[PDB]
Write a protein that binds this ligand. Structure first.
Ligand SMILES: Nc1nc2c(ncn2[C@@H]2O[C@H](COP(=O)(O)OP(=O)(O)O)[C@@H](O)[C@H]2O)c(=O)[nH]1
Ligand SMILES: [Mg+2]
Length: 326
């Protein structure tokens, strides 16, 4: 519920908002980055000050990658209030979604490795500790990896079919999970007809993921593979070219994280932003999906926001669930 001040470029503004709300922050104020970052505080001094003194702000979030000296300084000027850069932001998101100890360990590891430098710039006892913890985590992860190869695909069952909602950020993953579970988190079981179905708002596909935290991301996302079905959300407001990119990228990642032979209901979302190109885009998405993956359960136009084609969606989801109930 924490309130946040977002600093971002116009280019990635709608990107950051979606991600910040993903991280359970209320974006109370946004600020455009200044092109040339402050040598001390990265952002603007005056703007940093207003934030220092605005009691309505628990957290300062900067959708860029700050260097150690930036954190050091911004932290000084913001005693008590937390500052997140892009790395820490995504990491907080992963934490909100990671259920597996392995994924949790990847996140801890990366956070430690991200603090290590900030602390190293400047205590020895702390450094020594970070080192010892980083090593322990790697050994833990290393032994999990070994366990996996020396074990068989267990993959427990579930009382209720669980359907993970996947897709790029700002595609509408959350909006859809919300309208489907009539809320306003993470996992929720909903009754469609005489059958109950577990829904999961999954961690999305994420653009420009920094090297530091790719492992954390991959493992977090891979948890989706233990779903019975997946609803792939897609932003209909993309031009055909970008639309092709998204589809290509989506199924690339899905094959990457080991999704196979899993029914996928593709939803083309945001159709209330009508440009007159529905049919065109809908046929494009459907053809290309078929070409890239199987089994494609169905491809359907929707508006998570306006709830325009909700009944049919619930029908497809029901039919899908019924299909998986045996
Ligand atoms: N017009 C329209 N906007 C939508 C729709 N679904 C989501 N949005 C908006 O798109 C932005 C991203 O939504 P979000 O659920 O956070 O996307 P996510 O990052 O994939 O989970 C939000 O600000 C929504 O209000 C839709 O069906 N129609
Ligand atoms: Mg989200």
């Amino acid at each position: 519920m924490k309130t946040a001040a977002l600093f971002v470029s116009k280019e990635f503004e709608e990107e950051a908002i979606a991600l910040v709300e993903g991280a359970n922050y209320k974006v109370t104020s946004i600020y455009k980055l200044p092109k040339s970052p402050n040598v001390k505080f990265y952002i603007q001094y005056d703007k940093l000050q207003q934030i220092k003194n605005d009691e309505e702000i628990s957290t300062l979030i900067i959708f860029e990658q700050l260097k150690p000296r930036h954190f050091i300084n911004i932290r000084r000027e913001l005693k008590g209030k937390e500052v997140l850069d892009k790395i820490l932001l995504l990491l907080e998101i992963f934490a909100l979604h990671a259920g597996s100890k392995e994924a949790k360990m990847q996140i801890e590891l990366a956070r430690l490795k991200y603090e290590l430098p900030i602390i190293k710039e400047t205590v020895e006892s702390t450094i020594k500790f970070y080192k010892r913890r980083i090593n322990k985590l790697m050994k833990e992860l290393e032994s999990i990896k070994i366990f996996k190869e020396k074990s068989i695909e267990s993959n427990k069952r579930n009382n209720i079919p669980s359907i993970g909602i996947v897709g790029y950020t700002n595609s509408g993953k959350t909006s859809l999970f919300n309208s489907l579970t009539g809320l306003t988190p993470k996992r929720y079981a909903i009754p469609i007809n005489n059958r109950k179905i577990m829904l999961v708002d999954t961690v999305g596909f994420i653009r420009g993921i920094p090297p530091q935290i790719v492992d954390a991301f991959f493992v977090t996302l891979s948890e989706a593979k233990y779903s019975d079905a997946l609803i792939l959300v897609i932003d209909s407001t993309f031009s055909e070219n970008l639309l092709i990119e998204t589809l290509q990228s989506s199924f690339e990642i899905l094959r990457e994280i080991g999704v196979s032979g899993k029914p996928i209901l593709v939803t083309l979302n945001k159709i209330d932003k009508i440009n007159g190109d529905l049919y065109k885009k809908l046929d494009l998405v459907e053809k290309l999906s078929k070409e890239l993956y199987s089994p494609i359960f169905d491809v359907i136009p929707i508006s998570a926001l306006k709830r325009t084609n909700l009944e049919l969606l619930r029908d497809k989801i029901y039919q899908l669930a019924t299909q998986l109930s045996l």
